[PDB]
Design an enzyme around this catalytic site. Structure first.
Site, PDB file in Angstrom:
ATOM      1  N   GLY A 193       0.820  -1.229   0.000  1.00  0.00           N
ATOM      2  CA  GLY A 193       0.000   0.000   0.000  1.00  0.00           C
ATOM      3  C   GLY A 193       0.851   1.275   0.000  1.00  0.00           C
ATOM      4  CB  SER A 194       2.267   3.842   1.710  1.00  0.00           C
ATOM      5  CG  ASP A 241       2.120  12.744  10.347  1.00  0.00           C
ATOM      6  OD1 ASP A 241       1.075  13.445  10.546  1.00  0.00           O
ATOM      7  OD2 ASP A 241       2.278  11.995   9.345  1.00  0.00           O
ATOM      8  N   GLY A 243       8.295   6.559  -0.980  1.00  0.00           N
ATOM      9  CA  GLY A 243       7.512   5.979  -2.083  1.00  0.00           C
ATOM     10  C   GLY A 243       6.517   4.932  -1.588  1.00  0.00           C
TER      11      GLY A 243
HETATM   12  F1  LIG Z   1      11.341   0.460   5.209  1.00  0.00           F
HETATM   13  C1  LIG Z   1      10.020   0.713   5.360  1.00  0.00           C
HETATM   14  C2  LIG Z   1       9.627   1.967   5.768  1.00  0.00           C
HETATM   15  C3  LIG Z   1       8.278   2.203   5.955  1.00  0.00           C
HETATM   16  C4  LIG Z   1       7.343   1.197   5.736  1.00  0.00           C
HETATM   17  C5  LIG Z   1       5.906   1.425   5.996  1.00  0.00           C
HETATM   18  N1  LIG Z   1       5.340   2.667   5.729  1.00  0.00           N
HETATM   19  C6  LIG Z   1       4.078   2.533   6.065  1.00  0.00           C
HETATM   20  N2  LIG Z   1       3.775   1.298   6.538  1.00  0.00           N
HETATM   21  C7  LIG Z   1       2.462   0.853   7.022  1.00  0.00           C
HETATM   22  C8  LIG Z   1       1.472   0.579   5.912  1.00  0.00           C
HETATM   23  C9  LIG Z   1       1.883   0.440   4.596  1.00  0.00           C
HETATM   24  C10 LIG Z   1       0.946   0.145   3.625  1.00  0.00           C
HETATM   25  N3  LIG Z   1      -0.358  -0.028   3.879  1.00  0.00           N
HETATM   26  C11 LIG Z   1      -0.743   0.114   5.153  1.00  0.00           C
HETATM   27  C12 LIG Z   1       0.126   0.415   6.186  1.00  0.00           C
HETATM   28  C13 LIG Z   1       4.955   0.563   6.499  1.00  0.00           C
HETATM   29  C14 LIG Z   1       5.088  -0.834   6.989  1.00  0.00           C
HETATM   30  C15 LIG Z   1       4.109  -1.776   6.671  1.00  0.00           C
HETATM   31  C16 LIG Z   1       4.243  -3.060   7.166  1.00  0.00           C
HETATM   32  N4  LIG Z   1       5.265  -3.473   7.936  1.00  0.00           N
HETATM   33  C17 LIG Z   1       6.193  -2.557   8.240  1.00  0.00           C
HETATM   34  N5  LIG Z   1       7.269  -2.711   9.067  1.00  0.00           N
HETATM   35  C18 LIG Z   1       7.918  -1.501   9.152  1.00  0.00           C
HETATM   36  C19 LIG Z   1       7.279  -0.571   8.400  1.00  0.00           C
HETATM   37  C20 LIG Z   1       6.168  -1.230   7.796  1.00  0.00           C
HETATM   38  C21 LIG Z   1       7.791  -0.050   5.301  1.00  0.00           C
HETATM   39  C22 LIG Z   1       9.140  -0.297   5.118  1.00  0.00           C
END
Ligand SMILES: Fc1ccc(-c2ncn(Cc3ccncc3)c2-c2ccnc3[nH]ccc23)cc1
Length: 289
Positions: free
Chosen positions: A14-15, A123, A16
């Site tokens: 989801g959610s 945030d 560079g």
């Molecule tokens: F190196 C990174 C840096 C940031 C992220 C991240 N950013 C947002 N989320 C939550 C998310 C993402 C997409 N949809 C819903 C929620 C993450 C994430 C997602 C899952 N498990 C994770 N563990 C550590 C970060 C992360 C991920 C890896």
């Protein structure tokens, strides 16, 4: 696609963007953030610096690997589970008092840790807390250091200066009153934002939520004015007084005051005990059979 030496890149989470991946070597899922080497706001490498300085803390995601592959700068993290926003939505936007108090305890502690590392988060919102998976499923983690800033000198503990007239960088819904006034964010502000997040979980929404406006700057005006015209006792009516005591204490804090984290946890803990709850990390979502 082959990232680092040992990481296999899957489809998007989801959610560079955020991707599912596998540590092929260790047989564990991971999360990967890619950032193009072209961006008019290069972020990841700066964000990755901060995550590295947080490592070891309770409820800080572990960095597996940082580096560059092909077009991309890359960060790999242990996989985590759904956000508090995702769990709140999954629970029909209704959390029990027990759940809110279980969360509150941990959430205060994450913020306190970040401050111990000379940073403020700026945030604080439900999206930026994630539950763990597996053996870590009772653990609240905090993420997203993209708006974070040093509030004191690492070495000389010199607080940043009182600054004014600023733009609102962050999520308007959870922003402090002082943030709306264009004052420099400090430790007090992270805690006040948590205060609004907790009342959000109690209420299902906040009263300054979903105000119509013709433009953006106009919407922020309306949110500010609504917050500043909603007394704390009105926001918190029909919920234990502790939620009001918590916000009033946050709004009483001076710019460069060290918050009494301990006092704030004890507040919610006393209420916890008066309700006869047990710190068995059984959240509302753990009971969905
Ligand atoms: F190196 C990174 C840096 C940031 C992220 C991240 N950013 C947002 N989320 C939550 C998310 C993402 C997409 N949809 C819903 C929620 C993450 C994430 C997602 C899952 N498990 C994770 N563990 C550590 C970060 C992360 C991920 C890896």
């Amino acid at each position: 696609l082959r990232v680092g030496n040992r990481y296999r890149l899957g489809r998007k989470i989801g959610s560079g963007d955020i991707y599912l991946g596998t540590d092929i070597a260790a047989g564990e899922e991971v999360a990967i953030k890619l950032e193009c080497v072209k961006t008019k706001h290069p972020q990841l490498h700066i964000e990755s610096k901060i995550y590295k300085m947080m490592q070891g803390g309770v409820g800080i995601p572990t960095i597996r690997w940082c580096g560059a592959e092909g077009d991309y700068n890359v960060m790999v993290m242990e996989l985590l589970g759904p956000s508090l926003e995702d769990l709140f939505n999954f629970c029909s936007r209704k959390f029990s008092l027990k759940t809110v108090l279980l969360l509150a305890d941990q959430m205060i502690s994450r913020i306190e840790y970040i401050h111990s590392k000379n940073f403020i988060h700026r945030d604080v919102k439900p999206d930026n807390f994630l539950m763990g998976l597996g053996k870590k499923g009772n653990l609240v983690y905090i993420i997203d250091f993209g708006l974070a800033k040093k509030y004191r000198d690492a070495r000389t503990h010199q607080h940043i200066p009182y600054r004014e007239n600023k733009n609102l960088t962050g999520t308007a819904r959870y922003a402090s009153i002082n943030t709306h006034l264009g004052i420099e964010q400090s430790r007090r502000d992270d805690l006040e934002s948590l205060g609004y997040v907790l009342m959000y979980f109690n209420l299902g929404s906040l009263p300054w939520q979903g105000l119509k406006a013709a433009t953006k700057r106009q919407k922020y005006e309306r949110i500010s004015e609504k917050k500043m015209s909603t007394p704390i006792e009105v926001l918190c009516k029909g919920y234990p007084s502790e939620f009001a005591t918590y916000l009033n204490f946050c709004r009483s804090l001076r710019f460069d005051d060290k918050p009494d984290y301990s006092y704030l946890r004890q507040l919610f803990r006393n209420l916890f005990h008066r309700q006869g709850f047990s710190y068995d990390y059984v959240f509302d979502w753990n009971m969905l059979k």
